[PDB]
Amino acid sequence: VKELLEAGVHFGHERKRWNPKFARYIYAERNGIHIIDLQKTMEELERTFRFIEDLAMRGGTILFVGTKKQAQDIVRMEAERAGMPYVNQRWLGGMLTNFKTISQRVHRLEELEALFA
RNA sequence: GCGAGGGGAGCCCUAGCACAGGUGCUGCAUGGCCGUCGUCAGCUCGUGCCGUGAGGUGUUGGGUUAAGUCCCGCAACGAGCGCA
Ligand SMILES: [Mg+2]
Ligand SMILES: [Mg+2]
Ligand SMILES: [Mg+2]
Ligand SMILES: [Mg+2]
Ligand SMILES: [Mg+2]
Ligand SMILES: [Mg+2]
Ligand SMILES: [Mg+2]
Ligand SMILES: [Mg+2]
Incomplete structure (x- = not known):
């Protein structure tokens, strides 16, 4: 049950600070913000997860990288909670x-x- | 060797010979040792990254120190000759 849990508080992001090559994944500019297409995230999600599923079970490795401050810590949780490597402070x-x-x-x-x- | 002493074994002489000897020249042919900028805070390397290239980055920047001394940042991460 992903789906509406995305609308949860996780759809749309920034505004007029965009890269126009990201235009396909955008649903609209409601309220001067770029609301990103909810459902296209889902289409990208399965394809991605599927690559991870495959990569995971093959016993391979993901490297988690989040150095921006809001992610700093939630990255080192989930990476440790996966026995995977992470980069946290400086790349x-x-x-x-x-x-x-x-x-x-x-x-x-x-x-x-x-x-x- | 001779029972009457001649044969260059040391050694020492003179006559030749290979040579010694030269503080003669070239510190612009050199080693070594020294002076000197300067006990000044510097000069680099490996690999990565950037550039067609010479090269760059690191070693710039902010703070700090007697110091490239340490600190914080940073496409760099480290290291060596130095500093101590
Ligand atoms: Mg860094
Ligand atoms: Mg000379
Ligand atoms: Mg000399
Ligand atoms: Mg002279
Ligand atoms: Mg190249
Ligand atoms: Mg040092
Ligand atoms: Mg200084
Ligand atoms: Mg010393």
């Missing part, structure tokens, strides 16, 4: 593209994890 340059190197910092962390206890 660093090349966490992915220079992974090997940024990894060496994980490597260092648990050398110091190893000198507290």
